[PDB]
Write a protein that binds this ligand. Structure first.
Ligand SMILES: NC(=[NH2+])c1ccc(N)cc1
Ligand SMILES: [Cl-]
Ligand code: NA
Ligand code: NA
Ligand code: NI
Ligand code: NI
Length: 223
């Protein structure tokens, strides 16, 4: 997360860490007691998913739940065209027990409107190039589809939307993949991609446009 601040502990209860024995390669979002949503480029045959974390050390959180998962359902149009339809549903082995620090969030029905003040969180790269020790939070504003489409042409696809790109240089970055972008108390997008270096002025990050997939998500989860 570029130019953000430590989030208040457990203030983003839907945040999930997709981790390995040594690294953290992506985040995800709890959208149902038994399902975590993430970017399709974060795919793995199996996952160790960390919920209720602030620092990435599970023992530091009495309420943290590290859960296993091996079933992933990627959107069938992922990467067609290049980089589009960047989402995947990970079905946990067992439902998580929702608590004060762990909670699923609903997906936005309304599509992103330019100027909305939203929040993105993650454990990815900071402005100095180092990784944080705890979950980072930053506000970024949604950019119009007209600007997004022209800035990223021909990579822009309706399954994407742009946020950020201001002089404040706030942006998400490597390691924030699959993490949430929250607008109006709803999950509006997933950190998908952008340009390097992160946080260039006039270059907003790109996010998965979830308002375009609620039906597919509902169908996958429920069935
Ligand atoms: N928004 C970005 N600059 C970004 C997001 C994800 C990522 N893997 C790399 C860069
Ligand atoms: Cl705009
Ligand atoms: Na995308
Ligand atoms: Na959306
Ligand atoms: Ni470690
Ligand atoms: Ni805590």
């Amino acid at each position: 997360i570029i130019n953000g601040e430590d989030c208040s502990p457990h203030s983003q209860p839907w945040q999930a860490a997709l981790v390995m024995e040594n690294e953290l390669f992506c985040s995800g979002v709890l959208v149902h007691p038994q399902w975590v949503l993430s970017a399709a480029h974060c795919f793995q045959n199996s996952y160790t998913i960390g919920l209720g974390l602030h620092s990435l050390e599970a023992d530091q959180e009495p309420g943290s739940q590290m859960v296993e998962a091996s079933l992933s359902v990627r959107h069938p149009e992922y990467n067609r065209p290049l980089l589009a339809n960047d989402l995947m549903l990970i079905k946990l082995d067992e439902s998580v027990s929702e608590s004060d620090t762990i909670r699923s969030i609903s997906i936005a029905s309304q599509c992103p409107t330019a100027g909305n003040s939203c929040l993105v969180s993650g454990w990815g790269l900071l402005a100095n190039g180092r990784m944080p020790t705890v979950l980072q939070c930053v506000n970024v504003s949604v950019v119009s589809e007209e600007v997004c489409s022209k800035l990223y042409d021909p990579l822009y696809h309706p399954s994407m939307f742009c946020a950020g790109g201001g002089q404040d240089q706030k942006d998400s970055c490597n390691g924030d993949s699959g993490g949430p972008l929250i607008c109006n108390g709803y999950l509006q997008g997933l950190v998908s991609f952008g340009k390097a270096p992160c946080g260039q002025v006039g270059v907003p990050g790109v996010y998965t446009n979830l308002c375009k997939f609620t039906e597919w998500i509902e169908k996958t989860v429920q069935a």
